[PDB]
Amino acid sequence: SHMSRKIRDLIESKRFQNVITAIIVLNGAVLGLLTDTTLSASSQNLLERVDQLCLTIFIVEISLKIYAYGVRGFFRSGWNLFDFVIVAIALMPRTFRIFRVMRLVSVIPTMRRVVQGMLLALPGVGSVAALLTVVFYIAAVMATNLYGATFPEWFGDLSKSLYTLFQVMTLESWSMGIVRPVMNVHPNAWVFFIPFIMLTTLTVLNLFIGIIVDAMAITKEQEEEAKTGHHQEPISQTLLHLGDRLDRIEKQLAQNNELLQRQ
Amino acid sequence: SHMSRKIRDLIESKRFQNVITAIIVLNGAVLGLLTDTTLSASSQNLLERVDQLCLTIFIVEISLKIYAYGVRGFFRSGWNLFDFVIVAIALMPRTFRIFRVMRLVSVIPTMRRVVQGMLLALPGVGSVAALLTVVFYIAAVMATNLYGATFPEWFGDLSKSLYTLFQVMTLESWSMGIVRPVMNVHPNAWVFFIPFIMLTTLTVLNLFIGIIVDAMAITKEQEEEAKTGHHQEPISQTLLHLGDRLDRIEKQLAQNNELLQRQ
Amino acid sequence: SHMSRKIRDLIESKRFQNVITAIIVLNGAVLGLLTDTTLSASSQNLLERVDQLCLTIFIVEISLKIYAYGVRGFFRSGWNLFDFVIVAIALMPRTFRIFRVMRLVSVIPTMRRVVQGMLLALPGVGSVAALLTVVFYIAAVMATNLYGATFPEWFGDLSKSLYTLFQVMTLESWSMGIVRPVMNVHPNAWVFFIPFIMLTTLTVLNLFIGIIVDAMAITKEQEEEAKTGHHQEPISQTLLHLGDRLDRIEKQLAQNNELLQRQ
Amino acid sequence: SHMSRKIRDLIESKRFQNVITAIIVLNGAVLGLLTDTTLSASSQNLLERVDQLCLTIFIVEISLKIYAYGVRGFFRSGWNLFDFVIVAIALMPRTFRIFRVMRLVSVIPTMRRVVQGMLLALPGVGSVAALLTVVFYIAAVMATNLYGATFPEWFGDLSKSLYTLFQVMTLESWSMGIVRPVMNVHPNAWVFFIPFIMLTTLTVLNLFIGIIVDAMAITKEQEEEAKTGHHQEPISQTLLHLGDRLDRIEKQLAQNNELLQRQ
Ligand SMILES: CC/C(=C(\c1ccccc1)c1ccc(OCCN(C)C)cc1)c1ccccc1
Ligand SMILES: CC/C(=C(\c1ccccc1)c1ccc(OCCN(C)C)cc1)c1ccccc1
Ligand SMILES: CC/C(=C(\c1ccccc1)c1ccc(OCCN(C)C)cc1)c1ccccc1
Ligand SMILES: CC/C(=C(\c1ccccc1)c1ccc(OCCN(C)C)cc1)c1ccccc1
Ligand SMILES: CCCCCCCCCC(=O)N(CCO)C[C@@H](O)[C@@H](O)[C@@H](O)[C@@H](O)CO
Ligand SMILES: CCCCCCCCCC(=O)N(CCO)C[C@@H](O)[C@@H](O)[C@@H](O)[C@@H](O)CO
Ligand SMILES: CCCCCCCCCC(=O)N(CCO)C[C@@H](O)[C@@H](O)[C@@H](O)[C@@H](O)CO
Ligand SMILES: CCCCCCCCCC(=O)N(CCO)C[C@@H](O)[C@@H](O)[C@@H](O)[C@@H](O)CO
């Protein structure tokens, strides 16, 4: 309709996106000031008043979108479902008001395309995250049984062991703080710890390198799908078939010159 | 035979794989609860009873596979030999029961293909792991001779030195904890330590980047060999010959247009 | 003109570049000696005299360039504008004299091309640096509200929280030094900290891997643009179109052999 | 000659390489045992006797090579010049006997090809290592002037500052150990330190990623030059010209079909 077109063309404009962006920055700025313990009683009501003013602008913005696109059209996008929940949770009877700043990711398209590539990369590294989980669990059980009676603060139970093993994987005070003290009581503790470090830092790097490389390609390819309007063959698919394609055109040229030979 | 076909088609099904998967998760879960020092005497017999129930299911599962595939056919796979040893060791007269959870890697195909790529990548980095070993040995000998008489807790013998040099390579308390104390007695100790850190962190990164990049390619190529049923030319082989192949087709086209020129 | 050509051909020579290079190294060397608190009163006047001698050589060098290239021609380059400001600030009525050594980057072409590639790579990672900023701000606000009353030295205000969260992201004493003490008072603090570490170290790596890979390509391509004198298609553009280009030449060859078929 | 051919064909054999390899491992093993402070007086003469036995085998091995290849032919290789110096220094009137184990790199071909790729990669990263040097020098001068009077143990002079800044770059105790203490006296010290960390860890990663990627390609290409007997076009050269080459063959095919069109 006419009204469901003037409103939709306003929502898609960069001026509307900029206004909503400024309101999200204002909301985070006042929630930042609200961390000041030394504030006046009047300053707090004034800042929380600006928080309500921000939140009610988002309600008008979400309603504008639901009217302009429809219920099926608006809730079709996952980013719009996220936007809705962020705003709708503020009306549900909470130190997590600052999570409202996460809307900067969904409202700024370049930021939305960066996080999107990372989210789409996650399924690809599912097996590596599972492999790291298995290694942490087997290690936490072993550490609890081996060192829990002598080192209860660190390996007292499975939870204590999982936390310590995470600390050890991040290399934080692993030797001076954990393994050298454990070694005064258990001299061969390095046989557990050193291989654990080698195996976990390798797997974490594989997990991070994987997400980074896949998010880089997924983003680049979605950028090209947006530009050409058609499906982009993943770079690995092109790379796997590069040889196959190259030697097919060589055979076509040898057969091509065989026909020219008889002339 | 008929019976050696109904059984083999059950073993290959996703329902059988899921049941075995759930039994491996149950086994790890009860071994996890068995780390509770405050458990009842009855709770322990009950949990260890569930451990026997899990292990006897694996015995029936392994026997099903040896009947369905044969001794040569079953022990042909390296993953099946691993599965066998994990179960067979439990009957050999041991805090390493939790290692039974490693079966999640061999039973879940995606996980099996992740670890497989890493294992196949290891020979390629053999020279770098040897280079890092040589650097650690030469360094441990030097550190023992230089600092062992004044710093016996850290460089007292070769074993103490290897452990400290590993701690130093992981950058854990290397300066405040080891090198600043060593420097009060030996002012030029940084001439040993700083180059050691530079050389070892570079080589470890090379070792890890190597395993990660090769495991990524080996996996991608095995996935394509499974899909096409034929050998996949490694990406580096395609990359090395890309120029050679491209200019061969240029020469073929120049010769092709020379034949067309006379027409 | 004649004089505006003998001077410009001297400025572009490698002997002039080497002389200016040696004067920049001399300037840094005397500013290095000037950090000696135990120096003589005469040694300081002697060293600062060498500093004036260095700076006045740069004034003659900049003036030579402004005469040889013109005001529009000299200030057209961004590296020349930088050179000018470094020298002109020394005449403006300052422990930042050592920043004069940054001129080694602008005067040595290989160094200038390394920093240039990094600067040109920065816009590409703008969204990731913004994403890391958003995560740090949301986290600093949450940390101030959660732990500021019980841990005022570390999370007392937003500034204290931002600094501690940066320390935690660099993994420096994050557990033994910050999170284990916070956990005696707040047992579930690891629910905030562990996900914060996972999310920030991933994003920082993405930011650094991005700058490094883009600077590597931008440099390689600018080197080729200098060699060929024409625009170089970015590697990603070539990679995205590799499939498209390869199958277009296959169709051209199938159509080519269809014409030869009728002969 | 006949004798200068039986000897050269022995030197190139894998049995001779294996024997020399075992003697290098024996030499390192006895130098390792010689770090035992609790040894007998007789054990030391016995071990040092094995050291002379090892070293005299290397003298016969080097002489065999100089006779078989000639002075110009033997000293033509850089690896042979290294081998010579390692052995010849042992006869020059020294805790650096363990450096004799470095011969394992030059005698084992796969190890020799790994280190060679790294050495050939170093010139390519010369500008980045210079950039990191400039950043460390400018930073050391600033730190000495800013914090040397209040923190003399860490920033007392330029040498103390360079060591502390290296510790800070490796993130070792940078905050709890150095910057939080510096901040009690100088509240804005984080303005120096935090940007220094960001800039140096980025540049070190660039330096290491560069050496690793170039050593990986240089090795792969030298392996292919050994296999084909001809110069291998660097992968980046192939990548830069991939577009140029692909569209040249498209134009050749359009011109090719124009000739077929008139038939
Ligand atoms: C170009 C996008 C992509 C993808 C992808 C394709 C479709 C949907 C989502 C992601 C990808 C990710 C993982 C994967 O395999 C996991 C095991 N591997 C270790 C083999 C195979 C392909 C990818 C990214 C970078 C390089 C190569 C592929
Ligand atoms: C595609 C798989 C592969 C392999 C590979 C081939 C057959 C069996 C197993 C592994 C590889 C690994 C190492 C190698 O050379 C070691 C020295 N180099 C430093 C040259 C050469 C090739 C490889 C993986 C990623 C990139 C390039 C090659
Ligand atoms: C070859 C130079 C280049 C560039 C570049 C092009 C023009 C000017 C400046 C930089 C680049 C950088 C970022 C970018 O997209 C950001 C999101 N991405 C995650 C998709 C797309 C292209 C680039 C560098 C390395 C690999 C790929 C591209
Ligand atoms: C394939 C070997 C090679 C080389 C190389 C060529 C000849 C002799 C020695 C090394 C290389 C190294 C550095 C370089 O440029 C430095 C600036 N760059 C940032 C542009 C350009 C080429 C190289 C290695 C990996 C990828 C690309 C090139
Ligand atoms: C992928 C890695 C996943 C790591 C998971 C960590 C779980 C941590 C649970 C836990 O330990 N606690 C929360 C339950 O209350 C108790 C803590 O308060 C704390 O006291 C202990 O963690 C320390 O004493 C152990 O060294
Ligand atoms: C690739 C890296 C390989 C590192 C290999 C480490 C070997 C460690 C052997 C060892 O040191 N001990 C086990 C033998 O009993 C003794 C320990 O119990 C402990 O006391 C000492 O390690 C410390 O005192 C040294 O700072
Ligand atoms: C991208 C990351 C950006 C991090 C930004 C850090 C801002 C730090 C500002 C600040 O904290 N101070 C400067 C203002 O004077 C005060 C300091 O002097 C110091 O005392 C405190 O930082 C500590 O007490 C906190 O643990
Ligand atoms: C690329 C990075 C290059 C770093 C270069 C480090 C030079 C270190 C020289 C030096 O400091 N000393 C050797 C000269 O004798 C003195 C030491 O013995 C020691 O006491 C001091 O380093 C500490 O007090 C400083 O915190």
Ligand code: NA
């Ligand atoms: Na660290």
Ligand code: NA
């Ligand atoms: Na520490």
Ligand code: NA
């Ligand atoms: Na650390």
